[PDB]
């Protein structure tokens, strides 16, 4: 079969009366969760998955856009024009979301342990819905996601292309606290060791190195995320200071931000979060280093955030 682009329907576990935002929107845009979506599995079959070429990423992106624009109302927007708007302080709390396929179609799910994101997959299964996914609009670090069951996995449509970003799913979940931020230094060091293991297994044993990113807008240079509806910006220089072969990160809150929704800058009003680290976005610096190879944090593209969740799923048509 060939996958087809259709309009999936999101299935949430949300509640209407509750004040929270994602619940309010998901109430009228999504549906309740099926108690169980029959996981019809197939053994002696394989199919070609390309996480970097999946319409589900696009649709999810448009849904999150519709949520932000419909729910979280920025004070002011500058996108080649001007607009004045109210700024109600909202309750922002990502909840698990499913994406189910209508009748006549199904969702092929790659259940192979290690999968480099692209190429055919064995042990394929068929489902009507998707696992619990939380639309986390984070950068640099992926939060409240789904970590890889076994070991670590790194993915990129092309490792030898330094512009193309690199997605990472960890062996374990790392606790990060914010309110400034804190994080166990040791567990972080360990996860770094594992990443060095995979990377070294990727680039002919060349010595691996970590270092913070250079230049870019305050959104990209710093770990930007949301907390109760307020935009947090954190300095992750303490997490990238060593080279291989507890930590407290300072943060600010300036409402002048560059909308990920569109190439423009929107602002909010002054004000009036503990999570997991389930993935990492990185970029490689090619350069000319004979042995050293430096990887720095980056992001800014949310389709990369969704692809970290929708890499094994893909639509399909049937009778």
């Amino acid at each position, epitope marked *: 079969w060939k996958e087809a682009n259709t309009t999936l329907f999101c299935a949430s576990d949300a509640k209407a009366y509750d004040t929270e935002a994602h619940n309010v929107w998901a109430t009228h845009a999504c549906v309740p969760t099926d108690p169980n979506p029959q996981e019809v599995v197939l053994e002696n079959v394989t199919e070609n998955f390309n996480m970097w070429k999946n319409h589900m990423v696009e649709q999810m992106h448009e849904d999150i856009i519709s949520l932000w624009d419909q729910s979280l109302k920025p004070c002011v927007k500058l996108t080649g024009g001007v607009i004045t708007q109210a700024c109600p302080k909202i309750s922002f709390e990502p909840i698990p979301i499913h994406y189910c396929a209508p009748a006549g179609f199904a969702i092929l799910k790659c259940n192979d342990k290690k999968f480099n994101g692209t190429g055919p997959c064995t042990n394929v299964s068929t489902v009507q819905c998707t696992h619990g996914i939380r639309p986390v609009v984070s950068t640099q670090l992926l939060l409240n996601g789904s970590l890889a069951e076994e070991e670590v996995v790194i993915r990129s449509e092309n490792f030898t*292309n*330094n*512009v193309k970003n690199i997605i990472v799913q960890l062996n374990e979940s790392v606790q990060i606290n914010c309110t400034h931020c804190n994080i166990s230094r040791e567990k972080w060091q360990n996860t770094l060791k594992q990443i060095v293991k995979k990377l070294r297994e990727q680039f002919k044993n060349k010595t691996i190195a970590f270092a913070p990113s*250079s*230049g*870019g807008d305050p959104e990209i240079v710093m770990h930007s995320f949301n907390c109760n509806g307020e935009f947090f910006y954190c300095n992750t220089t303490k997490l990238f200071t060593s080279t291989w072969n507890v930590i407290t990160l300072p943060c600010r809150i300036r409402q002048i931000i560059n909308m990920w929704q569109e190439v423009g800058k929107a602002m909010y009003a002054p004000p009036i979060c503990s999570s997991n680290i389930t993935g990492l976005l990185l970029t490689r*610096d*090619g*350069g*000319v*280093d*004979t*042995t*050293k190879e430096t990887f720095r944090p980056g992001g800014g593209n949310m389709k990369d955030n969704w692809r970290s969740e929708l890499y094994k799923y893909k639509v399909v048509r049937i009778e």
Partner: antibody
Amino acid sequence: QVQLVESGGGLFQPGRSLRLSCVASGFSFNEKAMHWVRQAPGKGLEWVAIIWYNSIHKNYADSVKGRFTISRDNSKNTLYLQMNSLRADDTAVYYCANAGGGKYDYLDVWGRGTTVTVSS
Amino acid sequence: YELTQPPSVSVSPGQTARITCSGDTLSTKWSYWCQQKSGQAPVLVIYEGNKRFSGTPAKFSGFHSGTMATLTISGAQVDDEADYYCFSTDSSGQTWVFGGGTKLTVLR
């Protein structure tokens, strides 16, 4: 196949300013960094500038620092090099080359530059 | 900082020509070779020391070692005569620099 053309070269009396352009085609311009290089008549090549695909970074030789400003535009696949104060020694052929990648990478393909002459 | 390479390399036809390139930054940085024929734009020949971009003549080899990268040309011919340049970066990796240029010429 790659193609790089340069423009803006000519004769200009010293002290003036100038802008050189470089149109590209045949490769993912948006995913590559670009280098400006210079070569005086019958002399060795001299590196001028580099700029990243995203333009966030860019560096000049210590020779032309403070006068040259490198720019680009992916929506037009065009590279730019502005020269504020023209010196006699700035007379040379100006080549526009692409990068192996998009962040501080070797100079792969060269496009036949454009001659800039500075004379009083 | 500086990349020093011989100015001239005389060659009787058929012999194996060799050009050097010495720079303290070559210890931790690659060397990239380049060729420019008379009245023509320069052209890449060898990148990151050994590696070659097929399909260019295999007679162009690159031996990067220590602080010296050697461009070797097996069986030089009248066509090969040209001005070659080894280029690299400084210790920082932010700036690029070319060698002085080496003139490969057949002995007439």
